[PDB]
From a paper:
Exchange proteins directly activated by [name] (EPACs) are an important family of signaling molecules serving as the intracellular sensors for the prototypic second messenger. When the intracellular concentration of [name] rises, it binds to the [name] binding domain (CBD) of EPAC and induces conformational changes, in the hinge and switchboard (SB), that lead to activation of EPAC by exposing the C-terminal catalytic core, which interacts with and activates down-stream effectors, Rap1 or Rap2 partially through residues in the Helical Hairpin (HP).
First of all, even though [name]-F435G is active in solution without [name], the apo-[name]-F435G crystal structure still represents the compact, inactive apo form of [name], trapped by the crystal lattice, which is incompatible with the extended, active conformation. The structure of [name]-F435G shares the tertiary and secondary structure of apo-[name]. The domain-by-domain Cα-RMSDs between the two structures approach a resolution limited low value of 0.3 Å, while the overall Cα-RMSD reaches up to 1.2 Å. Second, while structural changes immediately adjacent to the site of mutation between WT and [name]-F435G are relatively small, major structural deviations occur at distal sites, particularly at the C-terminal catalytic lobe, suggesting global allosteric effects of the mutation. Gross structural changes due to the F435G mutation are observed for several loops, followed by moderate shifts in the CBD-A, REM and RA domains. The F435G mutant is intermediate between the apo-WT and holo structures, but more similar to the holo-conformation.
Residue numbers in the entry: 10 to 171, 178 to 462, 480 to 627, 639 to 957, 960 to 991
């Protein structure tokens, strides 16, 4: 089912409610900061009457002065709060920003005209509660809302005015760890001598670092270790014998709180078992809290006194602070050096007063504040993640508001006006902006770096910066790569090729007739240089783009006709003309089949396929059409052989019986089906009697008997070679097309399609075998078997199949088998737990980033994740900016494609011994699975009811 289906429920009108509709939504809503203190009954009530709003950037929900009609909670995005001190909304200024989890609008409780104009700052998702529903929830649950709502509706301060440093989970965490140490490395805690004085039962920093690195795979560096221990030290569960505020990887003594009492009792066998079961989850917990605890520690160093390392640690965390999201990478790297960290102990502290001089911009790291405006009162309340006082960075105007802390122990980041402006200027000092008609036409940063422009202008910069020195030959290929790769986005060949023809013949704009003699020569050599790097990118794909080939043809002429010649440059061009003259000259697609043991070969759109298209009566006609055939072309080929009347539709149908009518303009539909998906052609008349085939149902009997006689390392090995074949069949540009929309470029992504499909194919392979293994003793053997298969995959640096398997073993159908997991040897409970941790999405799948980075090609990446990166970057950044191609976006997406190149820049071939029989190869490459979840789930409930 859809990850986010709760939204579909918020759609369903209130009166048409369903218990599950509420169960689902509630499961989602419970995770909002403005619902935390909410009694379950309240949250349900909200679920029953709560509307959903998906607003676009720049929408105003209401203006200062209007009558308010709803109360809101932000699920995603952010909004600006603007207030005017006059009767003109043009004078309104932004005082603060509200992000996820924050709520506003409660002034409707007593019918007070809106204090402020609120505007979405970006695409936002809100929960909307109509006045009458809210007045009702408030009278009923007022006591549960006093902490959330601004006065007079709730209390002002929720701080000390009607507890120590340790918290519950961290006090716990410190206990687990001390128990593991005492158990695993007793020597680590003991009396230690240093200059006559002896420090009782304590540890050494470097040593705790050493140990944490040994005990778990989620820790990749001593620096990361430091952050993780600093979690316990700031919280005071692990203390430096001399009370330093920060943990250090040094020869310094620290003591566990438990060892603070002379007679600290040894661990009980129960505690050790209890610890042994929690160590992994404790470590994962600390890995997630560790980055920001480290940022805070380093940040306590004055801006001027921060080292390169300090700044990196700070920089890395900023990337995960919403408030800083819209800032550039450069400004963020600049901020690391000026950001001040500021904390306050007591609620009620006045951070600043309305009317005072505007000094700083604040971002709330911990706690909350009240926004106060004289005359109006508390206008809104802000929480962690929100920011305020940004007016101070615009002009020299006075505070339009007062900020008082709403609770004790608030943390903020603070940027002072002075530093903020230096950064803004220094950013122009490293900028270079060529203006044409009195506006930017090209922008760049000192190495230089293109940022934006038009296709024509961006093209000349790349031609113009080319270096024809054979020494910079590689360095030149480098700079041109982003352009040759991404150009299809903002400048297709239909516009590029002609533009290159022009540049080649164009007459030099400066110089003597003789000087120009030379100029035109270089320009020509440069244009040829770019064409070559251009042909290199497309490579084999050239023979799909009729234009591109036509161009080269006429372009090879121009290069020849020259009386004098570019000796050491031309030869390469004819090579391409001949190869496009040769391999293009053939009457073989080659005809491809799909319904032994082939070594995968790249599939091309122009390649013809023999494909089965089924009919209502489950008969089928085999048509022979190009891979890139359109739906219309397919219908025509079918309607012809069958003589089928007017009105045939083509329909995708998955094992689930689900049916999608395909559009006539759709291309390459063969590779975009589900694992067991089939393709049908029938009359729209009898669209309803269309039913899946018996074969799509999936296998009925397991296959455990077969591959249990196969070693985990042989299956893995054979899975990896196969994976490599699929992986290497993917042209780097297929990634580009996919990210931007295959339908656009009218080219295929068949190879990428098959490879991504392969991922899903593997994970359903796991869920299938498990669910088709009725015996309880023989499933436990599979978990061991799949876990070992994964292990060998990761060992082979095939992260692709590794994650596929792990995601299979995480499938609800497999996860719910409580009885089956519990009887698994603790050894494999450990491996698997470590496996899930690499799939942690926190900080943008950092766990995975670090794991892969610490490896050397050949390597198969976690490809679906890698696809999301591109999709993400695409949607979170505009291609065009004021009618100018956003080239930094281009580069960011090229970043990913290039990472693929690197991953497959070394051949794959481990120890000679795989030799291995073709039997395991056959199995691995001929998987037959159940891809119907509803099915797999039902089975799961027929092996272990509940």
């Amino acid at each position: 089912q859809s990850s986010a289906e709760w939204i579909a429920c918020l759609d369903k009108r209130p009166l048409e409610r369903s218990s599950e509709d509420v169960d689902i939504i509630f499961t989602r809503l419970k995770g909002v900061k403005a619902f935390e203190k909410f009694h379950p009954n309240l949250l349900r009530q909200i679920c029953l009457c709560g509307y959903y709003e998906n607003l676009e950037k720049g929408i105003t929900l209401f203006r200062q002065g209007d009558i308010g009609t709803n109360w809101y909670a932000v699920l995603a995005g952010s909004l600006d709060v603007k207030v005017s001190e006059t009767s003109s909304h043009q004078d309104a200024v932004t005082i603060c920003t509200l992000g996820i989890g924050t709520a506003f609008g409660e002034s409707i409780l007593d019918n007070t005209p809106r204090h402020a104009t609120i505007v979405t700052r970006e695409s936002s998702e809100l929960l909307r509660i109509e006045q009458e529903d809210f007045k009702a929830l408030w009278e009923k649950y007022r006591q549960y809302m006093a902490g959330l709502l601004a006065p007079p509706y709730g209390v002002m301060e929720t701080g000390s005015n009607n507890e120590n440093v340790p918290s519950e989970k961290i006090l716990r965490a410190g206990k687990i760890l001390r128990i593991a140490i005492l158990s695993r490395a007793p020597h680590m805690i003991r009396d230690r001598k240093y200059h006559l004085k002896t420090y009782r039962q304590c540890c050494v920093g470097t040593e705790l670092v050493d140990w944490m690195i040994q005990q778990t795979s989620c820790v990749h560096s001593r620096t990361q270790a430091v952050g993780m221990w600093q979690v316990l030290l700031e919280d005071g569960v692990l203390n430096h014998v001399d009370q330093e505020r920060h943990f250090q990887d040094k020869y310094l003594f620290y003591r566990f709180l438990d060892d603070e009492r002379e007679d600290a009792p040894l661990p009980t066998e129960e505690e050790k078992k209890e610890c042994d079961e929690e160590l992994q989850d404790t470590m994962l917990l600390l890995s997630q809290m560790g980055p920001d605890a480290h940022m805070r520690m380093i940040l306590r160093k004055p801006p001027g006194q921060r080292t390169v390392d300090d700044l990196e640690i700070i920089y890395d965390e900023l990337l995960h602070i919403k408030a800083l999201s819209h800032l550039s990478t450069t400004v963020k790297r600049e901020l690391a050096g000026v950001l001040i960290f500021e904390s306050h102990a007591k609620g009620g502290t006045v951070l600043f007063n309305q009317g005072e001089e505007g000094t700083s911009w604040y971002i709330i790291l911990k706690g909350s504040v009240n926004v106060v405006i004289y005359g109006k009162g508390v206008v809104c309340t802000l929480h962690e993640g929100d920011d305020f006082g940004k007016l101070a960075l615009v002009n020299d105007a006075p505070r339009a508001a007062s900020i008082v802390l709403r609770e004790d122990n608030c943390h903020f980041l603070r940027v002072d006006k002075e530093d903020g402006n230096r950064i803004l200027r220094d950013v122009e000092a490293n900028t270079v902006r060529l203006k044409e008609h009195d506006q930017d036409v090209l922008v760049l940063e000192k190495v230089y770096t293109v940022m934006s422009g038009t296709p024509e202008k961006i093209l000349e910069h790349f031609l113009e910066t080319i270096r024809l020195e054979p020494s910079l030959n590689e360095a030149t290929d480098s700079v041109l790569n982003d352009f040759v790769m991404m150009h299809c986005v903002f400048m297709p060949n239909t516009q590029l090729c002609p533009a290159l023809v022009a540049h080649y013949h164009a007459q030099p704009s400066q110089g003597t007739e003789q000087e120009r003699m030379d100029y035109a020569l270089n320009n020509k050599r440069r244009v040829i240089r770019l064409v070559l790097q251009w042909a290199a990118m497309y490579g084999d794909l050239l023979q799909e783009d009729d234009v591109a080939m036509a161009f080269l043809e006429e372009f090879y002429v121009s290069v020849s006709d020259d009386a004098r010649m570019m000796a050491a440059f031309k030869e390469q061009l004819p090579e391409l003309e001949k190869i496009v003259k040769q391999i293009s000259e053939d009457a073989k697609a080659p005809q491809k089949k799909h319904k032994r043991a082939q070594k995968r070969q790249p599939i091309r759109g122009s390649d013809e396929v023999l494909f089965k298209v089924y009919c209502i009566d489950h008969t089928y006609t085999t048509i022979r059409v190009p891979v890139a055939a359109s739906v219309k072309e397919v219908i025509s080929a079918v309607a012809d052989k069958l003589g089928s009347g007017e009105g045939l539709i083509i329909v995708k149908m998955n094992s689930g019986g689900e049916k999608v009518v395909l559009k006539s303009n759709d291309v390459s539909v063969f590779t975009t089906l589900t694992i067991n998906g089939r393709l049908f052609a029938c009359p729209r008349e009898q669209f309803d009697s269309l039913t899946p085939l018996p074969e799509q149902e999936g296998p009925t009997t397991g296959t455990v008997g077969t591959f249990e006689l196969m070693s985990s390392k042989d299956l893995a090995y054979q899975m990896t070679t196969y994976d490599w074949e699929l992986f290497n069949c993917v042209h780097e540009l297929e990634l580009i097309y996919h990210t931007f929309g295959r339908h656009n470029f009218k080219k295929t992504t068949a190879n990428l399609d098959l490879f991504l499909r392969r991922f899903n194919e593997i994970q359903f392979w796991v869920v299938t075998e498990v669910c088709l293994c009725s015996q309880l003793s023989k499933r436990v053997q599979l978990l061991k078997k799949f876990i070992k298969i994964a292990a060998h995959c990761k060992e082979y640096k095939n992260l692709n199949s590794f994650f596929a398997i792990v995601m299979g073993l995480s499938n609800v159908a497999v996860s719910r088998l409580a009885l089956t997991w519990e009887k698994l040897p603790s050894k494999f409970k450990k491996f698997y737990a470590e496996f899930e941790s690499l799939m942690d999405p926190s900080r943008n799948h950092r766990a995975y980033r670090l794991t892969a980075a610490k490896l050397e090609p050949p390597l198969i990446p976690f490809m679906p994740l890698l696809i999301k990166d591109m999709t993400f970057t695409h949607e979170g950044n505009k291609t065009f900016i004021d009618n100018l191609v956003n080239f930094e976006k281009m580069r960011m997406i090229a970043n990913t494609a290039r990472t693929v190149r690197y991953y497959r820049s070394q051949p794959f071939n481990p120890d000679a011994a795989q030799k291995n029989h073709q039997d395991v190869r056959s199995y691995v490459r001929q998987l037959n699975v159940i891809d119907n979840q509803r099915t797999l789930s039902q089975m799961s409930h027929r092996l272990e009811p509940r």
